[PDB]
Amino acid sequence: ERPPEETLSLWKGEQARLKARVVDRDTEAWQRDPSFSGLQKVGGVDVSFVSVRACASLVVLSYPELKVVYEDSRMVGLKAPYVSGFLAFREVPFLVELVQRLQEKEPDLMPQVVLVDGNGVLHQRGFGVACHLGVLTELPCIGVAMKLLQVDGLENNALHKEKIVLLQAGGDTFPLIGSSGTVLGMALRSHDHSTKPLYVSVGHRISLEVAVRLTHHCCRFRIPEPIRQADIRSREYIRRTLG
Amino acid sequence: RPPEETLSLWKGEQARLKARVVDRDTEAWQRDPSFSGLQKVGGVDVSFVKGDSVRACASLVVLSYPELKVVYEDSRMVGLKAPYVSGFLAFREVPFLVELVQRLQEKEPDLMPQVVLVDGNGVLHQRGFGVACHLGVLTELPCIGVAMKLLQVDGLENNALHKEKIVLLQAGGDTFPLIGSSGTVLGMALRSHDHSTKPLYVSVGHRISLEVAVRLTHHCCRFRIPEPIRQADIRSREYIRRTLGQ
Ligand SMILES: [Mn+2]
Ligand SMILES: [Mn+2]
Ligand SMILES: [Mn+2]
Ligand SMILES: [Mn+2]
């Protein structure tokens, strides 16, 4: 099912209002440090389905060791359908509740930055789920997407695929430049033995260049370890109650 | 796991039925250089539901040859009266496959396959009478055993020397024989495709020679798994998904 236009119209209005609070530069001392000295805790989130039955997961990993120091998985009911450009309106209230639970249970494990599976400013109205989560919690957030959201002239055509071929080693990047001339994100080759890139964008309180480089440092495999461990735990949490 | 009194009975039945195995070619297409006259190849599968030991789906497919297109398919949810015991695979699944073959005979007798590829060994077996022999003897159809892992019987071992021989298999179609302590050839390891490295283990079920079984298995491989066994797998899983409503 798809929401009526009157509902999407309210949602667009809310995205435009909250967009004013996005901060697209570094605001934390570790972010300006050549090796991120002072960064100790990286968060990742996930919301998986068995709809209605879904699992929202939050993990916190140590940095740079990338070991899980916190995990929480909660069975939730998301009735909102998926509409591209409105991902936050189906999951962000449950992700906020997970952050609030962490604050009440293990406040010293509050992450210094959260990797979100979905875009930040690379978005139809420049305000993706990673921005939305960052503004509601005021945590620094990075958007990490597996496919390219085709907005502002960006398209996964042959020219885009040629640039992907030029990504040869882990850490290699190319910028996603919209028709406006704005840089919306970066395509990142996240490790040496993978060819399909990550699409990284700013959520909140971080610069793009820092966001890219940290994402790279969190990649044992293609998927950054915080997002990957949240994915694993949400489906393994499902296996425990179902089956 | 069944008590030894039940396994003893099963060994006795394997010994009785083994007498009817025919380990040579008895069909004209088999002795043809290009299997001309072969038109229908069967594949079977029995897949179990995740979390339910007892409920399983038995599937029979028939493919055209050489085009390898599905021309018949049938699935049935079944109740399993025995757990998996290595060496007794037939006593878990053969009753359901026989009933599937009989249903084909009653509904589309002109689509009866000329040979069946079975996911499991034939004579490469603890007592020389694996599920592929067992199916072949109960239906009198020619059958080929195709296994993914090496059943370690009569001196066969998936040791370092075995892994070395797998390395010497260079392209699709390359083989080496599986030799028992007695010196007899129990089956072949076959590299079934160019873009795979893990071999198939091929053995005679019934009414076919090993060399013919190996060459036919190879010709049914679009991917690593021979297309009749692969389409039966796909169908069982798709049928399970639908019975669950998903
Ligand atoms: Mn995820
Ligand atoms: Mn997933
Ligand atoms: Mn199978
Ligand atoms: Mn399987």
UniProtKB/Swiss-Prot annotation, chain A:
It is found in: Cytoplasm; Nucleus, Nucleolus; Cytoplasm, Stress granule. GO terms for cellular component: cytoplasm; cytoplasmic stress granule; nucleolus. Mg(2+) binds at D46, D117. Coiled coil: none annotated. Its EC number is 3.1.26.-. Its main location: cytoplasm. Its cofactor is Mg(2+). Keywords: Cytoplasm, DNA-binding, Endonuclease, Hydrolase, Magnesium, Metal-binding, Nuclease, Nucleus, RNA-binding. The record marks Y82 as: Interaction with target DNA. Highest levels detected in liver with high levels also found in heart, kidney and testis. Expressed at low levels in brain. Transmembrane segments: none annotated. GO terms for molecular function: DNA binding; endodeoxyribonuclease activity, producing 5'-phosphomonoesters; magnesium ion binding; RNA endonuclease activity, producing 5'-phosphomonoesters; single-stranded RNA binding. One of its GO terms (biological process) is DNA repair. Endoribonuclease that specifically cleaves inosine-containing RNAs: cleaves RNA at the second phosphodiester bond 3' to inosine. Active against both single-stranded and double-stranded RNAs. Has strong preference for single-stranded RNAs (ssRNAs) toward double-stranded RNAs (dsRNAs). Cleaves mRNAs and tRNAs containing inosine. Also able to cleave structure-specific dsRNA substrates containing the specific sites 5'-IIUI-3' and 5'-UIUU-3'. Monomer. Interacts with PABPC1; the interaction is RNA-dependent and stimulates ENDOV activity. Belongs to the endonuclease V family. This is Endonuclease V. It comes from Mus musculus. The gene is Endov.
Swiss-Prot record, chain B:
Its cofactor is Mg(2+). Its EC number is 3.1.26.-. Highest levels detected in liver with high levels also found in heart, kidney and testis. Expressed at low levels in brain. Mg(2+) binds at D45, D119. GO terms for cellular component: cytoplasm; cytoplasmic stress granule; nucleolus. Endoribonuclease that specifically cleaves inosine-containing RNAs: cleaves RNA at the second phosphodiester bond 3' to inosine. Active against both single-stranded and double-stranded RNAs. Has strong preference for single-stranded RNAs (ssRNAs) toward double-stranded RNAs (dsRNAs). Cleaves mRNAs and tRNAs containing inosine. Also able to cleave structure-specific dsRNA substrates containing the specific sites 5'-IIUI-3' and 5'-UIUU-3'. This is Endonuclease V. It comes from Mus musculus (Mouse). The lineage of its organism: Eukaryota, Metazoa, Chordata, Craniata, Vertebrata.
